[PDB]
Amino acid sequence: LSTASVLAFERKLDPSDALMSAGAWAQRDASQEWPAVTVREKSQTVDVANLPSDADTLKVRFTLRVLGGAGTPSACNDAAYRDKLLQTVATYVNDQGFAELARRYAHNLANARFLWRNRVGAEAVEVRINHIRQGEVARAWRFDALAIGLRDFKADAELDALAELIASGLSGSGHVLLEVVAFARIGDGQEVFPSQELKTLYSVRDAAAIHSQKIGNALRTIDTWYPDEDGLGPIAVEPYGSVTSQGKAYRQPKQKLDFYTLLDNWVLRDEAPAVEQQHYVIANLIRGGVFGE
Amino acid sequence: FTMDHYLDIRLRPDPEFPPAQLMCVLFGKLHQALVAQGGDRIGVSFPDLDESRSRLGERLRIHASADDLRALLARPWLEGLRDHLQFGEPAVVPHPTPYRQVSRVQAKSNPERLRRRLMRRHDLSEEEARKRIPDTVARALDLPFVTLRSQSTGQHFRLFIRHGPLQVTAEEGGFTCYGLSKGGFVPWF
């Protein structure tokens, strides 16, 4: 049983591009006709995006599908390796559910990780999450992002409800489409922070926006299981688990905690790792990617 | 030799930014927390400063009065960084404190702005204003700078600040607008 030379996993938890529109706080429940934040030039020549001078609230809206079926690859050479992989993943799901991963995903939707620099220095951040079955709203959640911690994953009743929704989505027991809307008090005429292009700023039809893969980066910050230090905080799930800004690569292949090493030792040789490393490996399968040689 | 109330600020790591951006945003929290707060006898101390590495600091060491530090711990404007960084508590200071120098001092390493005002006042030409200013009048100060990339220029910028010498005797004074030295020393330990 050698490894498959071609492996490819399609991603789950597919977000969209977030749109930003500015308005006034306590006009917050009618946030449907708010004008968009436009990207303009000023003088070297750069691009800036600011709120209007009579508005102090940033609105960031995006959607999120939860697909499910997180074990089946989209391309694989071997048939025995693929069946062994499906028995391993089905063994994982039958031993324990998706409650841990959906709990941490629920905590990253609870606070405002997807407000990267816009969160820093704000008076109050409010997150509203809707579940959608038809042209309707099934169940609405309203959170408070500053009370919910940035580093401490503490339980709650509403987070257990939404974690049951996401965990029911990833298992393939239904269709899950969520609408996420975030509200931030920044100040009158202050500066918002869209994502930067390859100083140009990313936009859609006359509105500043954030890329989808950056929100997708903000959702999958699970990994509190580094060998080096658990005191810094959870940084996102990657094979050869690395941080581009810090210039460091945690979870080295010279150790035995890499994704490729744990996947090879747990599929081919039946050497099951610790439980939290199994959460890491299944988190990389929900991430998806191009694996194999 | 009498201000023995410290208010430290320990910096923890975060994945969404390095310590330089946290030092810039905390620099805004100091320019708006002290300049928009009040209290002249409240200074700050950077203990991880290194002129050979261009660093700013690995742990903040605040120095205030008894009530000057006893009323800033419960700051709701000090929130947000409670999730990003860590805090401490008040602790006494030792008797012999070394007189160090930490303050803000702006240098002029660009003759293009004074060539703009000198083009609006002196009436210089291209070759006469370009030759009236030599190339040696500009110099880059390699002190510990902070990338305060605010809404004046979109790209990343540098920071300018001048420190003082080391000494043992105590010479206290009034703090600056950013909690630095401008004629009065500060302890460094």
From Swiss-Prot, chain A:
Keywords: Antiviral defense. It holds the Pfam family Cas_Csy3. It comes from the Bacteria. Disruption phenotype: Mutants lose phage DMS3 infection-dependent inhibition of biofilm formation while there is normal biofilm formation in the absence of phage infection. Decreased production of crRNA in the presence or absence of phage. Disruption of the entire Y.pestis-subtype CRISPR region disrupts crRNA production but does not alter phage resistance (possibly OLNs PA14_33350 to PA14_33310, and the flanking CRISPR loci), indicating this CRISPR is not involved in phage resistance. The keyword Membrane does not apply. One of its GO terms (biological process) is defense response to virus. In this bacteria, Y.pestis-subtype CRISPRs do not confer resistance to phage DMS3 or MP22, but instead are required for DMS3 infection-dependent inhibition of biofilm formation and possibly motility. Part of the Csy ribonucleoprotein complex with a probable stoichiometry of Csy1(1),Csy2(1),Csy3(6),Cas6/Csy4(1)-crRNA(1). A Csy3(6),Cas6/Csy4(1)-crRNA(1) subcomplex is also formed. Belongs to the CRISPR-associated Csy3 family. CRISPR (clustered regularly interspaced short palindromic repeat) is an adaptive immune system that provides protection against mobile genetic elements (viruses, transposable elements and conjugative plasmids). CRISPR clusters contain sequences complementary to antecedent mobile elements and target invading nucleic acids. CRISPR clusters are transcribed and processed into CRISPR RNA (crRNA). Cas3 and Cascade participate in CRISPR interference, the third stage of CRISPR immunity (Potential). Involved in crRNA production or stability. This is CRISPR-associated protein Csy3. The gene is csy3.
Swiss-Prot record, chain B:
Changing residue 51 to K: Restores biofilm formation upon phage infection, crRNA forms. It comes from the Bacteria. GO terms for molecular function: endonuclease activity; RNA binding. Disruption phenotype: Infection with phage DMS3 inhibits biofilm formation; disrupting this gene restores biofilm formation despite DMS3 infection. Normal biofilm formation in the absence of phage infection. Loss of production of crRNA in the presence or absence of phage. Disruption of the entire Y.pestis-subtype CRISPR region disrupts crRNA production but does not alter phage resistance (possibly OLNs PA14_33350 to PA14_33310, plus the flanking CRISPR loci), indicating this CRISPR is not involved in phage resistance. Its EC number is 3.1.-.-. Changing residue 178 to F: Cleaves pre-crRNA 13-fold slower. Changing residue 106 to A: No loss of pre-crRNA cleavage, still binds crRNA. In this bacteria, Y.pestis-subtype CRISPRs do not confer resistance to phage DMS3 or MP22, but instead are required for DMS3-dependent inhibition of biofilm formation and possibly motility. This is CRISPR-associated endonuclease Cas6/Csy4. The lineage of its organism: Bacteria, Pseudomonadati, Pseudomonadota, Gammaproteobacteria, Pseudomonadales.
